[model samples]
Target: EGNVKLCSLEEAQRIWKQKSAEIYPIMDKSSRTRLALIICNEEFDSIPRRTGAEVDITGMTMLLQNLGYSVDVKKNLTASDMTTELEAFAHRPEHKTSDSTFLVFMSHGIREGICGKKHSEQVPDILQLNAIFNMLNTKNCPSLKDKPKVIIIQACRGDSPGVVWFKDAIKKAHIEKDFIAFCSSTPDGSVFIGRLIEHMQEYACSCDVEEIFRKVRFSFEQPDGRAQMPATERVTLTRCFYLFPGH
Candidate 1:
């Protein structure tokens, strides 16, 4: 080992107390309210159907419900409809009393944003990614100010291997305070979301959100027939956020 030293019981206790102060506060058991929104588009008018997406919907819904969140699930929304739903959700009165929120979008997408049901190679109807952050910012959604906003987007953002070139640029532009985002792959029976659901369900009870995401990514490190990597991006979380499942 490289210069390892063990701490005494008292020292360990002190460190534990310091770390606890850095965690986001959870509301009391009976009064706590957690909200989550899932918009999953599996069918499209012009685009090919995104098969196996039902698996994502089912798994995510069950997981969030298990985590003590009241989940609202939407299916097959166009770009305009998606915008309206998000706006309404962001403004819900429950957010004022809720400790945190989870927003998930799964669909066909490009470099710009998630695609609507009518999207195609020709007519592009996209719900711009930036619009989401703008809609939920402290100024727009004051009720959620200073609270953790966890966003998970499962879509393909072009053909490029995203981590290779524009990673830093994308991070600088989109990262905002108290927000954490995970952007991963989509298509025929998405392995990314499957692994994500598995890891989160397995670890959310004892681990923070970021660590759960790390476990999901780590699962893909071994050689497989294909390559899939899940990335947690645009994270500006200053404190640890535990789902504290069943709490």
Candidate 2:
């Protein structure tokens, strides 16, 4: 095994203090928000192609928790598991006061939707993404009414080669509220390239949340990248709403 550098308790405390000081203001301002991060690795089968999905979930969850958000994370969940968890989360009263909620889905997604445990089992994109939010609406969930919801979908929309449609599905859904949706690639293309996987670790460790996403988008749009184009959409109820402080 390779040698590793370990920090002493004093050193760890010092580092924590430094990070805490930097993020304290943001956390204080964002206290009202809660984040639900659902990551489906689908690791029980297909070890090669879906292996990185697990890595994405682990890394993302750690990063969010480090940022001082109350992150509820579920990893390697099946289709039914995801739906149930989302439903429960949407209906929970505590989530109503949450300033924002984030849902991350990393798995094998196609034009119709993402694959479940088996070939026949698939969860439609619209049903999986928007329906959950609709379920969280005031009439249904009550607690999460009027809160900003963010969904990060890292999956392919279609099988078309090198053809990407940079459009926001949630925006097209015609929901009237604060919602930010970020698709990894265009409508028909892949998002995770070798370069992204290689550099993402450094990027995550060094950059802020917004910067990290901006760079990821940039990478997707680059020539020779899997996504010929990238897309993002944000709907705001107020002029200065933000997940972190100093918006």
TM-score, per-candidate, Cα-based: 0.84, 0.61
lDDT of 1: 0.78
| Residue 144 lDDT, candidate 1, scale 0-100 | 82
TM-score of 2: 0.61
What's the residue-level lDDT of 177 in candidate 1? Answer: 74
Which candidate tops lDDT?
A: 1
Clashes of each: 0, 3
- Model 1 C-alpha lDDT per residue in residues 128-168, reported as the tens digit of each score: 88888888887778888778899999875456243332434
In candidate 2, which residue ranges exceed 4 Å CA deviation? 1-33, 44-49, 121-127, 157-176, 185-215, 233-241, 245-247
lDDT digits (tens) for residues 29-125 of candidate 2:
4445565766664554532346455555555665455433466766666667777777787776657456556676666665544444443334232
Q: Relative to the unseen true structure, what is the Cα RMSD of model 2?
A: 9.3
Give RMSD to native, each candidate.
8.1, 9.3
